[PDB]
Write an enzyme that holds these catalytic residues in place. Structure first.
Site, PDB file in Angstrom:
ATOM      1  N   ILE A  15       0.831  -1.200   0.000  1.00 23.37           N
ATOM      2  CA  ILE A  15       0.000   0.000   0.000  1.00 23.37           C
ATOM      3  C   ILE A  15       0.867   1.251   0.000  1.00 23.37           C
ATOM      4  O   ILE A  15       0.613   2.209  -0.740  1.00 23.37           O
ATOM      5  CB  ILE A  15      -0.949  -0.003   1.208  1.00 23.37           C
ATOM      6  CG1 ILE A  15      -1.839  -1.236   1.193  1.00 23.37           C
ATOM      7  CG2 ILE A  15      -1.807   1.240   1.164  1.00 23.37           C
ATOM      8  CD1 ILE A  15      -3.026  -1.109   2.106  1.00 23.37           C
ATOM      9  N   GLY A  18       6.593   4.734   4.621  1.00 22.84           N
ATOM     10  CA  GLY A  18       6.895   6.065   5.112  1.00 22.84           C
ATOM     11  C   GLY A  18       7.553   5.985   6.469  1.00 22.84           C
ATOM     12  O   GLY A  18       8.110   4.952   6.837  1.00 22.84           O
ATOM     13  N   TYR A  20       6.222   5.653   9.213  1.00 21.03           N
ATOM     14  CA  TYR A  20       5.585   4.636  10.048  1.00 21.03           C
ATOM     15  C   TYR A  20       6.249   3.271   9.849  1.00 21.03           C
ATOM     16  O   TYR A  20       6.502   2.533  10.811  1.00 21.03           O
ATOM     17  CB  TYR A  20       4.093   4.544   9.725  1.00 21.03           C
ATOM     18  CG  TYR A  20       3.778   4.588   8.243  1.00 21.03           C
ATOM     19  CD1 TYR A  20       3.585   5.792   7.565  1.00 21.03           C
ATOM     20  CD2 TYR A  20       3.728   3.412   7.513  1.00 21.03           C
ATOM     21  CE1 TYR A  20       3.295   5.809   6.200  1.00 21.03           C
ATOM     22  CE2 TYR A  20       3.464   3.413   6.160  1.00 21.03           C
ATOM     23  CZ  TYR A  20       3.246   4.604   5.501  1.00 21.03           C
ATOM     24  OH  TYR A  20       2.968   4.563   4.141  1.00 21.03           O
ATOM     25  N   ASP A 123      -0.654  11.993  16.086  1.00 21.16           N
ATOM     26  CA  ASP A 123      -0.235  12.274  14.716  1.00 21.16           C
ATOM     27  C   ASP A 123      -1.394  12.142  13.730  1.00 21.16           C
ATOM     28  O   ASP A 123      -1.257  11.561  12.654  1.00 21.16           O
ATOM     29  CB  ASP A 123       0.936  11.376  14.319  1.00 21.16           C
ATOM     30  CG  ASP A 123       1.640  11.874  13.075  1.00 21.16           C
ATOM     31  OD1 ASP A 123       1.559  13.087  12.801  1.00 21.16           O
ATOM     32  OD2 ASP A 123       2.277  11.069  12.368  1.00 21.16           O
ATOM     33  N   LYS A 125      -3.676  12.883  10.733  1.00 20.70           N
ATOM     34  CA  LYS A 125      -3.594  13.554   9.444  1.00 20.70           C
ATOM     35  C   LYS A 125      -4.542  12.858   8.492  1.00 20.70           C
ATOM     36  O   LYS A 125      -4.953  11.718   8.745  1.00 20.70           O
ATOM     37  CB  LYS A 125      -2.171  13.527   8.885  1.00 20.70           C
ATOM     38  CG  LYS A 125      -1.639  12.123   8.639  1.00 20.70           C
ATOM     39  CD  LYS A 125      -0.211  12.228   8.157  1.00 20.70           C
ATOM     40  CE  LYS A 125       0.647  11.228   8.866  1.00 20.70           C
ATOM     41  NZ  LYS A 125       1.098  11.861  10.138  1.00 20.70           N
TER      42      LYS A 125
HETATM   43  C1  LIG Z   1       1.429  10.139   2.505  1.00 24.41           C
HETATM   44  N1  LIG Z   1       1.052   9.019   3.353  1.00 24.41           N
HETATM   45  C2  LIG Z   1       0.875   9.167   4.778  1.00 24.41           C
HETATM   46  O1  LIG Z   1       1.066  10.185   5.359  1.00 24.41           O
HETATM   47  C3  LIG Z   1       0.503   7.934   5.562  1.00 24.41           C
HETATM   48  C4  LIG Z   1       0.102   6.692   4.789  1.00 24.41           C
HETATM   49  C5  LIG Z   1      -0.258   5.441   5.548  1.00 24.41           C
HETATM   50  C6  LIG Z   1      -0.217   5.495   7.055  1.00 24.41           C
HETATM   51  C7  LIG Z   1      -0.507   4.257   7.838  1.00 24.41           C
HETATM   52  C8  LIG Z   1       0.647   3.786   8.706  1.00 24.41           C
HETATM   53  C9  LIG Z   1       0.518   2.535   9.555  1.00 24.41           C
HETATM   54  C10 LIG Z   1      -0.785   1.769   9.494  1.00 24.41           C
HETATM   55  F1  LIG Z   1      -1.000   0.654  10.227  1.00 24.41           F
HETATM   56  C11 LIG Z   1      -1.912   2.266   8.623  1.00 24.41           C
HETATM   57  C12 LIG Z   1      -3.177   1.462   8.592  1.00 24.41           C
HETATM   58  O2  LIG Z   1      -3.677   1.028   9.571  1.00 24.41           O
HETATM   59  N2  LIG Z   1      -3.709   1.236   7.286  1.00 24.41           N
HETATM   60  C13 LIG Z   1      -4.906   0.470   7.093  1.00 24.41           C
HETATM   61  C14 LIG Z   1      -5.612  -0.246   8.004  1.00 24.41           C
HETATM   62  N3  LIG Z   1      -6.640  -0.800   7.355  1.00 24.41           N
HETATM   63  N4  LIG Z   1      -6.578  -0.419   6.030  1.00 24.41           N
HETATM   64  C15 LIG Z   1      -5.502   0.343   5.878  1.00 24.41           C
HETATM   65  C16 LIG Z   1      -5.014   1.004   4.601  1.00 24.41           C
HETATM   66  O3  LIG Z   1      -3.943   1.519   4.549  1.00 24.41           O
HETATM   67  N5  LIG Z   1      -5.889   0.994   3.463  1.00 24.41           N
HETATM   68  C17 LIG Z   1      -5.538   1.616   2.194  1.00 24.41           C
HETATM   69  C18 LIG Z   1      -6.117   3.035   2.282  1.00 24.41           C
HETATM   70  C19 LIG Z   1      -6.265   3.642   0.901  1.00 24.41           C
HETATM   71  C20 LIG Z   1      -5.634   2.805  -0.195  1.00 24.41           C
HETATM   72  N6  LIG Z   1      -6.003   3.489  -1.429  1.00 24.41           N
HETATM   73  C21 LIG Z   1      -6.096   1.362  -0.273  1.00 24.41           C
HETATM   74  C22 LIG Z   1      -6.108   0.716   1.101  1.00 24.41           C
HETATM   75  C23 LIG Z   1      -1.795   3.496   7.769  1.00 24.41           C
HETATM   76  F2  LIG Z   1      -2.815   3.904   6.983  1.00 24.41           F
HETATM   77  C24 LIG Z   1       0.190   6.731   7.848  1.00 24.41           C
HETATM   78  C25 LIG Z   1       0.554   7.978   7.081  1.00 24.41           C
END
Ligand SMILES: CNC(=O)c1ccc(-c2ccc(F)c(C(=O)Nc3c[nH]nc3C(=O)N[C@H]3CC[C@@H](N)CC3)c2F)cc1
Length: 284
Positions: A15, A18, A20, A123, A125
């Site tokens: 997915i 970063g 994280y 955090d 966002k």
């Molecule tokens: C520029 N990027 C950022 O700042 C940024 C980017 C990701 C994170 C982040 C870090 C650790 C995590 F554990 C999680 C998390 O729990 N993710 C999920 C839990 N269940 N589903 C998801 C998921 O990610 N789904 C996608 C969402 C849209 C997509 N199109 C298709 C599927 C997370 F999202 C933090 C900051």
């Protein structure tokens, strides 16, 4: 850690990655469940995350499992979109206000829950606010007390001024910033350094002093040489948000963490008198 304990998961796709760590979509090879996998061990953290396993709420992304195999994997309920992508997809028309209001209401419910257990997110966002086809929105990727340039756009001023022991109010600030961004389709305070972030806040809300924020001038990173800007009127900051919304946002952006509205008090604000739960237009 030991070996083979992630055997039960098939990576479907990366997915993203970063500060994280790395996040994958994966399928449990034996249960068939589709999940998100976060890839990153201290005991200070192992018992902190274990607490989060018990912190279950419909507006918090469920932590399903924690698996240590030189890697720590957290297994999360999967959601199909995040608020950033939905904001961008909605930029031509904007997110309709009733949807904005529903999302804000729901996140305040989740935060009210977290905060009642003295858990901070730290955090928030748009990228870690996850949405589904049913109109729900959920808090993801809670920040730890210890723990691709980190954004400062949603960072509360007491953090930027060097507060070591900050409070749940930091999450109220972040969410107010996100609220403003949903309404206007522009980030409120898109700073690209810590001082650019502080000064962007100062230029809109006024340079804080002991009148509005008792103790501000004794904060670790406060400097008397800070320029003194006058506050702008909110009607200029988030038009065309109505007066209920502006009122609530003003209280979510108070400088003084002790004046900033709590999540529970915000739920009672008259802005939510007519809140509903609309269906988003999500193309997956
Ligand atoms: C520029 N990027 C950022 O700042 C940024 C980017 C990701 C994170 C982040 C870090 C650790 C995590 F554990 C999680 C998390 O729990 N993710 C999920 C839990 N269940 N589903 C998801 C998921 O990610 N789904 C996608 C969402 C849209 C997509 N199109 C298709 C599927 C997370 F999202 C933090 C900051």
């Amino acid at each position: 850690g030991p070996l083979g304990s992630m055997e039960n998961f098939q990576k479907v796709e990366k997915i993203g990655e970063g500060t994280y760590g790395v996040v994958y979509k994966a399928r449990n090879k034996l249960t068939g469940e589709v999940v998100a996998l976060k890839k990153i061990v201290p005991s200070t953290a192992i018992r902190e995350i274990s607490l989060l396993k018990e912190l279950n709420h419909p507006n918090i992304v469920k932590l399903l499992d924690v698996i240590h195999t030189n890697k720590l994997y957290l297994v999360f309920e999967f959601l199909h979109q995040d608020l950033k992508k939905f904001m961008d997809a909605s930029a031509l028309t904007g997110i309709p206000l009733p949807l904005i209001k529903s999302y804000l209401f729901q996140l305040l419910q989740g935060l009210a829950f977290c905060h009642s257990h003295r858990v901070l997110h730290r955090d928030l966002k748009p990228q870690n606010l996850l949405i589904n086809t049913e109109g729900a929105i959920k808090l993801a990727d809670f920040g730890l007390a210890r723990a691709e340039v980190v954004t400062l756009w949603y960072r509360a001023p007491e953090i930027l001024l060097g507060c070591k022991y900050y409070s749940t109010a930091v999450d109220i600030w972040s969410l107010g910033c996100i609220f403003a961004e949903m309404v206007t389709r522009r980030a409120l305070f898109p700073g690209d350094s810590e001082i650019d972030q502080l000064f962007r806040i100062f230029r809109t809300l006024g340079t804080p002093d002991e009148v509005v924020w008792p103790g501000v001038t004794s904060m670790p990173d406060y400097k008397p040489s800070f320029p003194k800007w006058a506050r702008q009127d909110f009607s200029k900051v988030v038009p065309p948000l109505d007066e209920d919304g502006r009122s609530l946002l003003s209280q979510m952006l108070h400088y003084d963490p002790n004046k900033r509205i709590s999540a529970k008090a915000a739920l009672a604000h008259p802005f939510f008198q007519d809140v509903t739960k609309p269906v988003p237009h999500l193309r997956l």
